[PDB]
């Protein structure tokens, strides 16, 4: 059984990575320039793009790549590090509004995770939560188009 979404972890911080097109992607503000661990020693990032808050290593063992969205849809779903699914309406190229705002803690640690369209395909990586007073009401995300061109 392979996973598309790996739950990763720095000494000082914990987030997610999403595997898309054979790359294991995640957020720069979490990984930095770090290497991803492997049973054969540290592996270096294939891609670093501090501009778009994006790094990518080769996909690890026990992973399955996600397919890039072509649905064009505006009804996304955010998957949290607890495997919760959060419906999000899309507002812009890289912005979307929760259908039911959750406490900020609910979305915590779930950046680098996928935003999926109705077909399950990747629309983007959850990048940062937009809060009013501790209540996440919307999210920033790196649209998958960015990943595809970064390659």
């Amino acid at each position: 059984v392979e996973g598309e979404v790996q739950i990763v972890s720095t000494a000082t911080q914990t987030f997610l990575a999403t595997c898309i097109n054979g790359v294991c992607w995640t957020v720069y503000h979490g990984a930095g320039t770090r290497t991803i661990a492997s049973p054969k020693g540290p592996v270096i990032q294939m891609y670093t793009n501090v501009d778009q808050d994006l790094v990518g290593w080769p996909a690890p063992q026990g992973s399955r790549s996600l397919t890039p969205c072509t649905c064009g849809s505006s009804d996304l779903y955010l998957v949290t590090r607890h495997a919760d699914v959060i419906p999000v309406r899309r507002r812009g190229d890289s912005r979307g509004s929760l259908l039911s705002p959750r406490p900020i803690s609910y979305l915590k640690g779930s950046s680098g995770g996928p935003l999926l369209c109705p077909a399950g395909h990747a629309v983007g990586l959850f990048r940062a939560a937009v809060c009013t007073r501790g209540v996440a009401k919307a999210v920033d995300f790196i649209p998958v188009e960015n990943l595809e061109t970064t390659m």
Partner: peptide
């Protein structure tokens, strides 16, 4: 330091 994988999520819900 280095990023380590501490768990995995399968979107399809597929059982082992």
């Amino acid at each position: 330091g280095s990023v380590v994988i501490v768990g995995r999520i399968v979107l399809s819900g597929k059982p082992a």
